[PDB]
Design an enzyme around this catalytic site. Structure first.
Site, short mmCIF file in Angstrom:
data_model
loop_
_atom_site.label_atom_id
_atom_site.label_comp_id
_atom_site.label_asym_id
_atom_site.label_seq_id
_atom_site.Cartn_x
_atom_site.Cartn_y
_atom_site.Cartn_z
N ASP A 128 19.12 94.12 -1.03
CA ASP A 128 18.35 93.41 0.00
C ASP A 128 19.17 92.35 0.77
OD1 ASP A 128 18.63 91.24 -1.64
OD2 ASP A 128 16.54 90.94 -2.13
N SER B 233 20.60 89.57 -0.63
CA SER B 233 20.76 88.37 -1.38
C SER B 233 21.94 88.59 -2.31
CB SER B 233 19.50 88.04 -2.16
OG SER B 233 19.19 89.11 -3.05
N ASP C 58 23.44 87.40 -6.44
CA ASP C 58 23.20 86.80 -7.72
C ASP C 58 24.47 86.04 -8.19
OD1 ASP C 58 20.60 88.06 -7.89
OD2 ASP C 58 21.30 89.54 -9.34
N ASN D 51 23.06 91.95 -3.95
CA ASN D 51 21.85 92.81 -4.09
C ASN D 51 21.69 93.69 -2.88
OD1 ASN D 51 21.06 91.53 -6.54
ND2 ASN D 51 20.37 89.79 -5.35
N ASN E 136 19.42 84.45 -8.21
CA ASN E 136 19.42 85.11 -6.89
C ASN E 136 19.16 84.12 -5.78
OD1 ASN E 136 16.67 85.11 -5.51
ND2 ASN E 136 16.15 85.94 -7.53
N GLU F 193 24.01 90.21 -17.90
CA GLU F 193 24.05 89.76 -16.56
C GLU F 193 25.48 89.54 -16.07
OE1 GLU F 193 21.76 89.94 -14.54
OE2 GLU F 193 19.87 89.74 -15.64
CS LIG Z 1 22.63 91.14 -11.55
CS LIG Z 2 22.71 92.50 -8.55
CS LIG Z 3 20.25 92.96 -9.28
#
Ligand SMILES: [Cs+]
Ligand SMILES: [Cs+]
Ligand SMILES: [Cs+]
Ligand SMILES: [Cl-]
Ligand SMILES: [Cl-]
Ligand SMILES: [Cl-]
Ligand SMILES: [Cs+]
Ligand SMILES: [Cs+]
Ligand SMILES: [Cs+]
Ligand SMILES: [Cs+]
Ligand SMILES: [Cs+]
Ligand SMILES: [Cs+]
Ligand SMILES: [Cs+]
Ligand SMILES: [Cs+]
Ligand SMILES: [Cs+]
Ligand SMILES: [Cs+]
Ligand SMILES: [Cs+]
Ligand SMILES: [Cs+]
Length: 129
Positions: free
Chosen positions: A48, A50, A52, A46, A59, A35
Site C-alpha cells: 500500500d 507505507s 514498516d 508494504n 507501520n 518481524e
Molecule cells: Cs513486516
Molecule cells: Cs511489510
Molecule cells: Cs507487512
C-alpha cells in the site's frame, strides 16, 4: 543493532513489555524474531506504500511519521527513524499503543501466523532476565 534473543528479552523486560496487556515476554520475543530477526534497522515497504520500521516493524500508515505515506496519522507521535535506534524505548512505547488498539498482538500479522498458540516460552528459555 542485531540483538541476541536473551539480550532482547531483557531489554523488553526492562521497558515493561513482559506481560503487557497479558502478553508474556515470549510472545514479544517471538514477534520480534519473525518481524525483524532482532535487527533494529529492519525496514520493509508494504504493498500500500507505507513502510514498516524496526524490531517490531511498526507501520507508517498509522503509527509513525516517514514523510512519504499519504493519509497517515503518526499515532505514536514519533518519526519512523526513531524506531531504528539501537535503544528500543521508542519501539516499545509505540508497541504498547498498538497492542492496546483493540486486537491485541493480532496487529502483528506474523505474530498471528507464527507465534500465536505456539510454545512462546521457548523464546525466553535459558535467559537470565
Ligand atoms: Cs513486516
Ligand atoms: Cs511489510
Ligand atoms: Cs507487512
Ligand atoms: Cl534466535
Ligand atoms: Cl505528508
Ligand atoms: Cl488481548
Ligand atoms: Cs508490565
Ligand atoms: Cs511479568
Ligand atoms: Cs523481506
Ligand atoms: Cs517488501
Ligand atoms: Cs506527514
Ligand atoms: Cs501523514
Ligand atoms: Cs499525531
Ligand atoms: Cs512519543
Ligand atoms: Cs480502536
Ligand atoms: Cs483496531
Ligand atoms: Cs496490521
Ligand atoms: Cs497450537
Amino acid at each position: 543493532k542485531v540483538f541476541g534473543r536473551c539480550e532482547l528479552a531483557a531489554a523488553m523486560k526492562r521497558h515493561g513489555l513482559d506481560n503487557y496487556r497479558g502478553y508474556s515476554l515470549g510472545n514479544w520475543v517471538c514477534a520480534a524474531k519473525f518481524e525483524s530477526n532482532f535487527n533494529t534497522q529492519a525496514t520493509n515497504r508494504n504493498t500500500d506504500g507505507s513502510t514498516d520500521y524496526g524490531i517490531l516493524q511498526i507501520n507508517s500508515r498509522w503509527w509513525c511519521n516517514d514523510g512519504r505515506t499519504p493519509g497517515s496519522r503518526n499515532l505514536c507521535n514519533i518519526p519512523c527513524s526513531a524506531l531504528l535506534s539501537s535503544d528500543i524505548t521508542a519501539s516499545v512505547n509505540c508497541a504498547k499503543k498498538i497492542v492496546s488498539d483493540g486486537n491485541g498482538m493480532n496487529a502483528w500479522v506474523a505474530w498471528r501466523n507464527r507465534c500465536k498458540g505456539t510454545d512462546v516460552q521457548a523464546w525466553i528459555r535459558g535467559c537470565r532476565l
